[PDB]
Amino acid sequence: GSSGSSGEEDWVLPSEVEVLESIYLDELQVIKGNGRTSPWEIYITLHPATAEDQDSQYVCFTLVLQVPAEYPHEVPQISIRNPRGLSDEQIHTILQVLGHVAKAGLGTAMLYELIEKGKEILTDNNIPHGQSGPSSG
Numbered sequence: 001g002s003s004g005s006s007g008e009e010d011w012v013l014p015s016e017v018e019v020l021e022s023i024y025l026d027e028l029q030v031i032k033g034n035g036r037t038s039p040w041e042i043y044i045t046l047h048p049a050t051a052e053d054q055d056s057q058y059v060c061f062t063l064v065l066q067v068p069a070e071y072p073h074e075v076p077q078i079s080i081r082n083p084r085g086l087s088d089e090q091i092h093t094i095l096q097v098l099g100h101v102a103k104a105g106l107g108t109a110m111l112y113e114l115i116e117k118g119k120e121i122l123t124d125n126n127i128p129h130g131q132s133g134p135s136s137g
Contacts, residue, residue: 013040013071016109028115040067042111043081046118048126059085059126061094063118065111072110075102085128094121 017030017040028044042065047057061084066077078098080091101117102110 012109013067013111016111017042020112024115037069039069040071041065042067042076044115044118045082046115046122048119048122050126059122059128061086061091061118061122063098063115065114067111072105072107075099075106076111076114078102078114086122086125087129090125090129093125094118097121 020028021030024044028042031041031043033039033041043062044065045060045062047053047060050057050059052058060082062081064077064079064081066079068074068076078095080086080094083091086094098114098117098121101114105113
């Protein structure tokens with residue numbers, strides 16, 4: 001909703017990716033597009049700083065980051081893929097939070113950050129849902 005006859009050939013989205021590809025070369029995967037939207041889809045599976053991790057990571061979620069054409073102007077579509085251990089409830093929170101970070105970091109690089117948050121979030125709700133019913137309420 002903004003008359004945009006023409007802008008500039010600048011994009012920070014890629015400027016940040018070129019770096020991430022070096023750090024999370026494998027820890028994260030990036031995808032390119034074509035056409036007008038040419039949305040860049042990126043995936044990554046974060047894990048808690050739990051001890052057992054040393055061997056295996058029971059809980060894990062492939063943080064999906066879909067960077068549209070507007071980006072950064074437009075926050076990347078955040079979605080939890082292959083949510084292990086986490087429940088519909090927990091997952092819901094992860095998204096809401098992760099999203100907040102983006103909206104707050106609009107116009108500027110956020111992807112990198114958005115990812116970090118995911119790690120922390122889980123760290124807290126690492127343990128799987130036990131007894132049915134929220135203790136607090």
